[PDB]
Ligand binder design. Structure first.
Ligand SMILES: [K+]
Ligand SMILES: [K+]
Ligand SMILES: [K+]
Ligand SMILES: [K+]
Ligand SMILES: [Mg+2]
Ligand SMILES: [Mg+2]
Ligand SMILES: [Mg+2]
Ligand SMILES: [Mg+2]
Ligand SMILES: [Mg+2]
Ligand SMILES: [Mg+2]
Ligand SMILES: [Mg+2]
Ligand SMILES: [Mg+2]
Ligand SMILES: [Mg+2]
Ligand SMILES: [Mg+2]
Ligand SMILES: [Mg+2]
Ligand SMILES: [Mg+2]
Ligand SMILES: [Mg+2]
Ligand SMILES: [Mg+2]
Ligand SMILES: [Mg+2]
Ligand SMILES: [Mg+2]
Ligand SMILES: [Mg+2]
Ligand SMILES: [Mg+2]
Ligand SMILES: [Mg+2]
Ligand SMILES: [Mg+2]
Ligand SMILES: [Mg+2]
Ligand SMILES: [Mg+2]
Ligand SMILES: [Mg+2]
Ligand SMILES: [Mg+2]
Ligand SMILES: [Zn+2]
Lengths: 85, 88, 211, 104, 122, 33, 129, 222, 71
RNA sequence: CACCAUGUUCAA
RNA sequence: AGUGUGGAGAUCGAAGAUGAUUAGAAACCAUUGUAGUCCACACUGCAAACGAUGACACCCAUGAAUUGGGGAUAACUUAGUAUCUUUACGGGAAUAUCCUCAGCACGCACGCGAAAGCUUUGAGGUUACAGUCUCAGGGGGGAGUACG
RNA sequence: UGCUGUUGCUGUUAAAGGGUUCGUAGUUGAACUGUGGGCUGUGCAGG
């Protein structure tokens, strides 16, 4: 015998695999990160799926490159995920 | 107290069919795929004392291959099977 | 079905029972998955074979044993094996438990053709593999016979009421599962004690070539 | 009258595409859609066993160490020629669903 | 052709089953036994029965024959099969050691009874 | 054959016969008016 | 597009009951859908149900017993007077002994038996039995 | 003269099973028509030949003509059965169909239209039986309505024991082979519909073969 | 399939009106072509004068001379 | 892969 | 396919020509050959223009694949994994395991259908008949004809 | 005669989805502003 799935309270494994708009309550997949510029040496908050040109205030160097999904951070920079809330 | 009753209080039903313990579905006289399973009760020792618990499963569930899942749910509900292993 | 009304842990699995299962490789699948058998699979190996949850193995095995023990009049339980690997195992199971058995090809109409002089009407059907015992299962679906089946990770569960997830291919695995089932039925009946190990050997349950 | 085949005798699902440009039948030249025509890739020996033995004996180039060249041809037949040449035969209704995905 | 009909084949199988000990590999002696142990109008049928009876005996010496049930030999087989080893094979495997995969290792570690003693990773 | 009983000539040729008939009738009316 | 939320909800429940499920998820939700479920629940044809808030048109998870045979909306709403109740029971109910036609009246959403008892007509929403 | 070949037949002959309701409750198949003959008292069982028509199979030497017979059996008290059998001769077909009708007997639930006074007179709810293109809808009717149905379904309903019912039909109802079966299926559906009066949980009894297993074993032994 | 809207009466009325003409019996009753072609002119009986006696051969597979009169 | 066209009307 | 005006015209080829076959053969076969076949522009709007299956929306069981883009390496509180190439459209490329959304589909449970068959791709969820809109059909011919 | 079908028809193959798309009248059209407490008595209410 095993646990039957409950529609109102799904398991972690079942919920984690679902599309963001197919979850029981829809929500974002993205987040924000603190990025230290390899040339300006300064902290800038960068969207995880940034599509526009994000540049460091000091060096004026691009901190990321847009892709089809998540933005790609330039080599050398250090990033830290900020809390969702 | 089950079945159709008269104004005089007399039961007029020819008979009362069984109800599936998984889907609350009436088991018809022509099913021939519905089964009745008796599970022996066990006392403090590993020996069965005198009694059994009976499960009725409709034939449609067995044809769909969900009888095993239903029996698992019923036995867990009745306290026969343990839903998970104990803590290490 | 290790849970009893009083709450005693008498029917729970022990270390020796687990050792027998692991030694005979009763927990190994077929690297092929079935939707109904998915719940019984703990995980997958590096080589791709599926690992069967032993706790669910024991729960189904005890439940099957209690169902068999509930049958007051033995030989109303028929144990069928068309694999030719479980023919010895079911023969020894029938000896110790007192049930009927049939090995080899299942004759179509055995449970339905009532004037064939071989017409038998068992109350419980036990099969070694649903895929190869499909004919017996199909006929049982016409005469209200519940089915207990040894099922591997890819077995079809149509008209199967109690499925024991195990390795139903290997000679040693088939013998051990029937040996454990026979021992549990005897313990549930009370003809043997649980503190003393069963004197019978699983090698007799093992199938041997007629050479 | 009755729908004989689910795929209607061709590899063109209802919402895959509109038109497949036809090809000329290998035997008679009849135009048939490429996805419908019976396609066979044939690798034939230039010589049978006896003639190849004689030519290899007379050849300083070809022998046990160097094989003779073969003919490579993609042959697409119209349905009529495929049946008449016995490249393909009418089959029992239950056997019509049997498909092969590699040359046996 | 010289195919033996079911009448000859069935009678020959019955003759072998009932009088196996009295038969041998010689047609003429087998035929002489058959004249006494069978009732039939046809001498030709009896001769055909003897021919296939000798054929069955020759096949029996090499191995078992489907449809021929000889009580003494089948009991001789099952008594031989009953002979059990001194120690159980499962006990020998446990004594020599048990090796399980990583996934089995995780499952046993999660079990309430824990890891069995002589079960080790591989 | 790939069709059921036509119960007549091939429908394409019956359509052509009708088409020629319509052409003749509209020519006759044209010469009349 | 989806024209009737109530029809979508009732059809989803009827299909789940027909398939023998123990739970069914409903989307989207509405006040009318909730009131219909409560009338069903008050007569015992469904068990518990939970309304999940998503800051949008919410969702409902309904616990199904084995008693519901069929439920469905009636479209268009087909306003019904107090003298038309017997006509609707004859047309869309399996029997005069069980089953309910659910109406929306100025006294609220209720079954036809309660509507007749309170002497009010309305518009037919659906049925269940 | 009757030698039961089934455990149910042995129990019926030994009078361990006394009513068809026990057979119906556990949904056991009935393989011997003598079971129905014994369990139904003399005079309470009636049978009628519904339809006999010939069928033909073309051959190289003409055609082979057989006869298909439809037989209805009932007690006018909630039990109905239909048997269809083909034979080389009409009399053989009739006898075989009577046996088949007994083997196919089913219970029929009867109910009330309005007030529940006296014995049930109609069906409890609307039912529909389908066979081929033929579908028969049975609708509960008030007392005194009678059986408003075509003669073939009316005869089946009379044998089943229904007194008042409305009937509508669709499809090629002149195919009486399908019409008889469609009416029979609609009647058989009466006990499969879950009504609020059947919601209460029922105590599960023992299968009579299981209960009398030791006696059945003695019959097999001797 | 058909429309179902609460305010779709005009569509349903128009749909029925157009489709009734496909009923051959309805079209005959609601047109004048049959009445014009009917020699009786819609009456149940008509009086006449016999012009000649004729014998009409019966259709196959029958074979007879049906006695008739031109009126 | 030369060339094979036709079979009076009902009814067994 | 056909039409108009300019181009173009290798190949194939309605019409036609010749040679065979045949009782006849102004058919099938063979050798040819006009209009065409190709392009530009302008007409035509007649296809088995087919999935012979209207559009939008909801529910719906199973196994193996495939195209495109992303993500990761008493009803339980979380339950892996690589291989090959690698001085410039290169922090690259493709595989492997898992998840996911969108697309063309295959063998596959209900249920449906007169059946053939259909089946998250319905022809299922329908006499237990109501999500929305729209087109067409009402025995076979006459006839898609006559008239306008 | 549910063969005119609002109730209540049919349209893969029986008669019948328009070759495709745009599109006006017309028909149809997502959720939300919300349904109250307290006291007494009473009812296998229930966990
Ligand atoms: K093809
Ligand atoms: K097509
Ligand atoms: K695609
Ligand atoms: K508009
Ligand atoms: Mg959880
Ligand atoms: Mg054909
Ligand atoms: Mg084709
Ligand atoms: Mg596309
Ligand atoms: Mg096309
Ligand atoms: Mg050489
Ligand atoms: Mg043909
Ligand atoms: Mg046609
Ligand atoms: Mg006639
Ligand atoms: Mg002829
Ligand atoms: Mg010029
Ligand atoms: Mg040329
Ligand atoms: Mg057209
Ligand atoms: Mg399409
Ligand atoms: Mg079309
Ligand atoms: Mg793509
Ligand atoms: Mg599919
Ligand atoms: Mg409709
Ligand atoms: Mg017409
Ligand atoms: Mg009418
Ligand atoms: Mg009427
Ligand atoms: Mg019609
Ligand atoms: Mg058509
Ligand atoms: Mg609204
Ligand atoms: Zn060709």
């Amino acid at each position: 015998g095993f646990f039957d799935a409950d529609l109102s309270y799904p398991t972690v494994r079942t919920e984690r695999m679902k599309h963001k708009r197919r979850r029981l309550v829809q929500g974002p997949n993205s987040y924000f990160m603190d990025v230290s510029c390899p040339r300006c040496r300064q902290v800038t908050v960068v969207y995880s799926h940034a599509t526009t040109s994000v540049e460091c205030k000091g060096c004026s160097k691009k901190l990321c490159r847009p892709t089809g999904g998540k933005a790609l951070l330039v080599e050398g920079c250090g990033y830290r995920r900020k809390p969702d809330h | 107290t089950i079945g159709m009753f008269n104004e005089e209080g007399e039961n007029v039903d020819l008979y009362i069919p069984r109800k599936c313990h998984a889907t609350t579905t009436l088991i018809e006289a022509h099913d021939h795929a519905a089964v009745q399973i008796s599970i022996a009760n066990v006392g403090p020792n590993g020996v069965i004392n005198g009694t059994t618990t009976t499960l009725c499963i409709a034939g449609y569930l067995r044809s769909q291959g969900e009888s095993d899942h239903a029996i698992n749910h019923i036995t867990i509900d009745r306290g026969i099977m343990r839903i998970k292993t104990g803590k290490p | 079905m290790s849970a009893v009304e009083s709450g005693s842990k008498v029917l729970r699995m022990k270390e020796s029972d687990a050792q027998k299962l692991l030694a005979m490789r009763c927990h190994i699948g077929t690297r092929n998955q079935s939707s109904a058998m998915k719940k019984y699979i703990y995980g997958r190996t590096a080589e791709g074979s599926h690992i069967i949850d032993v706790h669910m193995m024991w729960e189904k095995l005890i439940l099957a044993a209690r169902v068999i023990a509930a049958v007051e009049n033995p030989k109303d339980v028929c144990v069928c094996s068309s694999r030719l690997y479980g023919t010895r195992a079911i023969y020894k199971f029938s000896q110790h438990v007192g049930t009927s058995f049939h090995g080899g090809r299942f004759i179509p109409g055995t449970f339905t053709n009532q004037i064939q002089k071989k017409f038998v009407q068992p109350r419980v059907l036990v099969v070694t593999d649903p895929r190869t015992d499909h004919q017996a299962i199909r006929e049982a679906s016409l005469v209200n016979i519940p089915v207990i089946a040894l099922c591997d990770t890819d077995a079809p569960l149509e008209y199967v009421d109690i499925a024991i997830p195990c390795n139903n291919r290997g000679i040693k695995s088939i013998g051990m599962m029937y040996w454990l089932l026979a021992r549990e039925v005897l313990r549930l009946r009370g003809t043997i004690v649980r503190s003393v190990p069963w004197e019978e050997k699983v090698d007799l349950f093992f199938y041997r070539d007629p050479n | 009258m009755t729908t004989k085949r689910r795929n209607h005798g061709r590899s063109k699902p209802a919402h895959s595409r509109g038109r497949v440009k036809p090809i000329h039948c290998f035997n008679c030249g009849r135009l048939t859609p490429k996805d419908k025509a019976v396609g066979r890739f044939v690798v034939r020996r230039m010589l049978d066993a006896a003639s190849a033995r004689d030519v290899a004996e007379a050849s300083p180039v070809y022998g046990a160490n160097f094989p003779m060249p073969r003919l490579y041809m993609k042959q697409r037949f119209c349905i009529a020629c495929a049946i008449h040449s016995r490249t393909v035969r009418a089959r029992p209704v239950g056997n019509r669903k049997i498909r092969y995905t590699k040359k046996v | 052709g010289k195919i033996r009909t079911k009448t000859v084949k069935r009678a020959s199988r019955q003759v072998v089953e009932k009088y196996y000990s009295k038969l041998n590999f010689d047609f003429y002696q087998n035929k002489r036994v058959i004249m006494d142990v069978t009732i039939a109008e046809s001498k030709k049928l009896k001769n055909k029965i003897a021919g296939y009876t000798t054929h069955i005996m020759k096949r029996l010496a090499r191995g078992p024959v489907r449809g021929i049930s000889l009580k003494l030999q089948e009991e001789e087989r099952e008594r031989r099969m009953d002979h059990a080893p001194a120690t159980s094979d499962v006990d020998k495997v446990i004594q020599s050691g048990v090796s399980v995969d990583k996934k089995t290792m995780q499952m046993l570690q999660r079990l309430e009874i824990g890891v069995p003693r002589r079960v080790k990773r591989a | 054959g790939t069709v059921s009983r036509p119960r007549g000539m091939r429908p394409k040729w019956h359509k052509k016969r009708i088409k020629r008939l319509k052409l003749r009738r509209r020519r006759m009316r044209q010469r009349s008016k | 597009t989806m024209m009737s939320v109530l029809a979508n909800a009732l059809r989803t429940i009827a299909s789940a009951e027909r398939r023998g499920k123990r739970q069914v998820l409903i989307r989207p939700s509405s006040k009318v859908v909730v009131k219909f479920l409560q009338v069903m629940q008050k007569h015992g044809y469904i068990g518990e149900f939970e309304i999940i808030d998503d800051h949008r048109a919410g969702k409902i998870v309904v616990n199904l017993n084995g008693r519901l045979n069929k439920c469905g909306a009636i479209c268009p709403r087909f306003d019904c007077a107090t003298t038309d109740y017997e006509k609707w029971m004859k047309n869309i109910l399996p029997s005069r002994q069980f089953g309910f036609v659910v109406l929306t009246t100025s006294l609220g959403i209720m079954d036809h038996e309660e509507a007749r008892s309170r002497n009010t007509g309305g518009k037919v929403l659906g049925f269940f039995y | 003269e009757w030698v039961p070949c089934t455990k149910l037949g042995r129990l019926v002959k030994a009078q361990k099973v006394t009513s068809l309701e026990e057979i119906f409750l556990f949904s056991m198949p009935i393989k011997e028509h003598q079971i129905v003959d014994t369990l139904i008292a003399e005079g309470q069982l009636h049978d009628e030949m519904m339809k006999i028509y010939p069928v033909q199979k073309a051959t190289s030497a003409g055609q082979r003509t057989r006869f298909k017979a439809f037989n209805v059996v009932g007690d006018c008290d909630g039990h109905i059965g239909i048997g269809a059998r083909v034979g080389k001769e009409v009399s053989l077909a009739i006898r075989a169909s009577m046996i088949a009708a007994k083997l196919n007997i089913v219970p029929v639930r009867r109910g009330y239209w309005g007030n529940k006074i006296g014995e049930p007179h109609t069906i409890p709810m609307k039912v529909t039986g389908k066979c081929g293109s033929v579908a028969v809808r049975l609708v509960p009717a008030p007392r005194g309505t009678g059986i408003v149905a075509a003669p073939v379904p009316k005869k089946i309903l009379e044998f089943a024991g229904v007194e008042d019912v409305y009937t509508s039909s669709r499809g090629k109802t002149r195919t009486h082979g399908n019409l008889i079966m469609a009416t029979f299926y609609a009647l058989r559906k009466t006990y499969g519909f879950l009504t609020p009066d059947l919601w209460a949980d029922t105590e599960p009894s023992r299968d009579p073969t299981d209960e009398h297993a030791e006696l059945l074993a003695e019959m097999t032994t001797a | 399939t058909k429309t179902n809207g609460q305010n779709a009466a005009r569509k349903l009325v128009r749909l029925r009106c157009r489709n009734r003409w496909a009923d051959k019996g309805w079209k005959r009753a609601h047109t004048f072509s049959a009445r014009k072609a009917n020699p009786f002119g819609g009456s149940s009986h008509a009086k006449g004068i016999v012009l000649e006696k004729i014998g009409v051969g019966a259709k196959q597979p029958n074979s007879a001379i049906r006695k008739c009169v031109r009126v």
